[PDB]
Structure formats: structure tokens, C-alpha cells
Design an enzyme around this catalytic site. Structure first.
Site, PDB file in Angstrom:
ATOM      1  CG  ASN A   1      -1.776   1.262   1.318  1.00 32.35           C
ATOM      2  OD1 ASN A   1      -1.325   2.397   1.131  1.00 32.35           O
ATOM      3  ND2 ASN A   1      -3.059   1.036   1.590  1.00 32.35           N
TER       4      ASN A   1
ATOM      5  CG  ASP B   1      -0.730   7.622   1.933  1.00 34.20           C
ATOM      6  OD1 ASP B   1      -1.920   7.964   1.756  1.00 34.20           O
ATOM      7  OD2 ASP B   1       0.107   8.368   2.484  1.00 34.20           O
TER       8      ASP B   1
ATOM      9  CD  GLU C   1      -4.473   4.029   1.072  1.00 29.81           C
ATOM     10  OE1 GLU C   1      -4.013   5.185   1.207  1.00 29.81           O
ATOM     11  OE2 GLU C   1      -4.659   3.263   2.046  1.00 29.81           O
TER      12      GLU C   1
ATOM     13  CE1 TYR D   1      -7.102   0.775   1.537  1.00 30.68           C
ATOM     14  CE2 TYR D   1      -8.303   1.930  -0.201  1.00 30.68           C
ATOM     15  CZ  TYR D   1      -7.838   1.870   1.107  1.00 30.68           C
ATOM     16  OH  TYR D   1      -8.142   2.887   1.981  1.00 30.68           O
TER      17      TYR D   1
ATOM     18  CG  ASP E   1      -4.729  -1.924   3.503  1.00 28.22           C
ATOM     19  OD1 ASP E   1      -5.272  -2.496   4.467  1.00 28.22           O
ATOM     20  OD2 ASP E   1      -4.481  -0.695   3.512  1.00 28.22           O
TER      21      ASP E   1
ATOM     22  CG  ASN F   1      -8.637  -1.120   6.664  1.00 28.58           C
ATOM     23  OD1 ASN F   1      -7.689  -0.332   6.755  1.00 28.58           O
ATOM     24  ND2 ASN F   1      -9.823  -0.897   7.239  1.00 28.58           N
TER      25      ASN F   1
ATOM     26  CG  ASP G   1      -0.424  -4.166   3.912  1.00 28.44           C
ATOM     27  OD1 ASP G   1      -0.416  -3.328   4.840  1.00 28.44           O
ATOM     28  OD2 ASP G   1      -0.728  -3.880   2.730  1.00 28.44           O
TER      29      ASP G   1
ATOM     30  CG  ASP H   1       0.103   5.065   5.326  1.00 29.03           C
ATOM     31  OD1 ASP H   1       0.326   4.364   4.322  1.00 29.03           O
ATOM     32  OD2 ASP H   1      -1.021   5.549   5.553  1.00 29.03           O
ATOM     33  CG  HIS H   2       0.014   0.593   4.626  1.00 30.86           C
ATOM     34  ND1 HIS H   2      -0.769  -0.508   4.898  1.00 30.86           N
ATOM     35  CD2 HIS H   2      -0.760   1.674   4.876  1.00 30.86           C
ATOM     36  CE1 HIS H   2      -1.966  -0.111   5.289  1.00 30.86           C
ATOM     37  NE2 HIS H   2      -1.986   1.210   5.284  1.00 30.86           N
TER      38      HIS H   2
END
Ligand SMILES: [Mn+2]
EC number: 3.1.11.2
Length: 276
Positions: free
Chosen positions: A26, A28, A54, A129, A168, A170, A241, A266-267
Site C-alpha cells: 500500500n 498511500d 492506494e 484494498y 491491505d 484493513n 497487509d 505509511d504501510h
DNA sequence: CTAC
DNA sequence: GATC
DNA sequence: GATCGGTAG
């Protein structure tokens, strides 16, 4: 002594060398990520397949450096039908995929470019995602509608050919999958409903969490860290993830990795090794 | 601003 | 979302 | 929990 990812184990349980390598990540923001030299790392890790979440590249214009990739020539994307710089995924491959389809076959879940299904010879790879429930669990009820439909979709794919789901997802499955388990019962990403949905997907397909299978008791392992409060520095992160595999792919499993030191988002990236 |  |  | 608090399009 929080967390340090073990050395890559390039052999299946039976002794055969890993023949395939899939990396999920991911980012971002795709462009922002490349700017942060994200390719330099991927080109280094040189995965056989690259899955990204993302991407947020809804301008019909994907970066130039992307075509400057010989080992991931065949590239597939999927972005939202009506939402700029939001969500978006991608799947880059070395060899050419038998067939590549988008979404989950459900008109109300295929509108945000979150799924890309890549069918190969020995298996089918699905990168994804998952829709975030958001703050105040505003979209929690919808997430629940997503989960069911989603697992129902994958269950029909695995029925025909072995499945490898990366991305991801989530959600920190069990308490060991996040730093503050107790302080987030009511936070988006660790709700009971979500956690239950993850258990659902696993027992219905069925699927196996690669890392949590090879590393049954290993704590403090995460793939996400909020940029706020310098969370990554204190290792206050979540494991969102995954690399879920069909049971028949377990003898083919060499190793599931967490690229914790790799930066650019951020991942962090996760990587899988398969002796196919 | 907003969803992350 | 991590903090206090 | 009441607050404070990072982000790429
Ligand atoms: Mn994000």
C-alpha cells in the site's frame, strides 16, 4: 527488542527452491511514493509480481518511470469510476497473465478500483484494498456488506483453481496483530464485526494467513504505522497487509516477509515466496 | 475540506 | 489513532 | 474518551 524480520527462507517445506516472488504494497499515493524513490527499492527487491494499493492515479496519467521497468512490463490498473486521487490499485507482472479481470462481479462494490484478479497457470492471484470503515465507524455497516460479498466471490474462484490473496485487508485479525489491542476495540480496523469477517473469509474459502501460519507466536509484527505521533518510531503499528493462501498452496510456501525497514509510505511492503 |  |  | 493531530489527490 520489538521487531526485526527474519532472513528470507527460499525453500518450501519439502526442500524445493522458491520459483515465484510476489510483493504487495500500500503506497498511500503512487506519485508521491515514486518521488520518495519507491521504485529504487522495488527494482532492488525485484519481485516476479508487484501488487499496489492506494495508487490514487485517477488522472489517466501514470508516471513515466513505470514504463522504465523491464521485469514488470505487463501492468494492470483499476481506479474508481467517480473519485479523483482516491483509492486505486495496480498489479505489475514479469510473465504474462493468462487473463486479468477487475472487481468482484458485484456492481455496488466494483466502483472504487479496489480489486484486480490475475489468473495464471498453477493459481490465481487477487490483490486488494479493502474499504475502510472510517472514523466513528461511519461506514461500518457497509464494510460488512463488502466482506460477505467479497469472501463469497473468492470462494467461487478458489473452487476452480488455487488462490493467493494479497493486499491491505484493513484489519488486525487477532490481538497479536496490533500494538494496543484493548485501546482499539471500537476503532476502525479492529472492530468485532471486522475481526469476525476476517475469520469468516479464512474458514469459508478456505484460506491461510501465510505469516501467521509460519510465525504462530511472533508478536510486534506490523505493516502499518500512522504518521501521527511518530508512531513508526515506537513501532505502534498494525498488521493490515496479508498474503492469504489456499491450503493446497501450503506445501508450496517458502516464506512470507514483512519489509519493515523499507520506506515510502505509511504501510510497509510484504513479500511472498512460492516454490511452484 | 475530506477520507485516510 | 495514539495519549493521558 | 476529550483532545490533539499527519496525509496524498
Ligand atoms: Mn492509507
Amino acid at each position: 527488542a520489538l521487531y526485526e524480520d527474519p532472513p528470507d527462507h527460499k525453500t518450501s517445506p519439502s526442500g524445493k527452491p522458491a520459483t515465484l516472488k510476489i510483493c504487495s504494497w500500500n503506497v498511500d499515493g503512487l506519485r508521491a511514493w515514486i518521488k520518495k524513490k519507491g521504485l529504487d527499492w522495488v527494482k532492488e527487491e525485484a519481485p516476479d509480481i508487484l501488487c499496489l494499493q492506494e495508487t490514487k492515479c485517477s488522472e489517466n496519467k501514470l508516471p513515466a518511470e513505470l514504463q522504465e521497468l523491464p521485469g514488470l512490463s505487463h501492468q494492470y490498473w483499476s481506479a474508481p469510476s467517480d473519485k479523483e486521487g482516491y483509492s486505486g490499485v495496480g498489479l505489475l507482472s514479469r510473465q504474462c497473465p493468462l487473463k486479468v479481470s477487475y472487481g468482484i462481479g458485484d456492481e455496488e462494490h466494483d466502483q472504487e478500483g479496489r480489486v484486480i484478479v490475475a489468473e495464471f497457470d498453477s493459481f490465481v492471484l487477487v490483490t486488494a484494498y479493502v474499504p475502510n470503515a472510517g472514523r466513528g465507524l461511519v461506514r461500518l455497516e457497509y464494510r460488512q456488506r463488502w466482506d460477505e460479498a467479497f469472501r463469497k466471490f473468492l470462494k467461487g474462484l478458489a473452487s476452480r483453481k488455487p488462490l493467493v490473496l494479497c493486499g491491505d485487508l484493513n484489519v488486525a485479525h487477532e490481538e497479536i496483530d496490533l500494538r494496543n489491542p484493548k485501546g482499539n476495540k471500537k476503532n476502525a480496523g479492529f472492530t468485532p464485526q471486522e475481526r469476525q469477517g476476517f475469520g469468516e473469509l479464512l474458514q469459508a474459502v478456505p484460506l491461510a494467513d501465510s505469516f501467521r501460519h509460519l510465525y504462530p507466536n511472533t508478536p510486534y509484527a506490523y505493516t502499518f504505522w500512522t504518521y501521527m505521533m511518530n508512531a513508526r518510531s515506537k513501532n505502534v503499528g498494525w498488521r493490515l497487509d496479508y498474503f492469504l493462501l489456499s491450503h493446497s498452496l501450503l506445501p508450496a510456501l517458502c516464506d512470507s516477509k514483512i519489509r519493515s525497514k523499507a520506506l515510502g509510505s505509511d504501510h510497509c511492503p510484504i513479500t511472498l515466496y512460492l516454490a511452484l
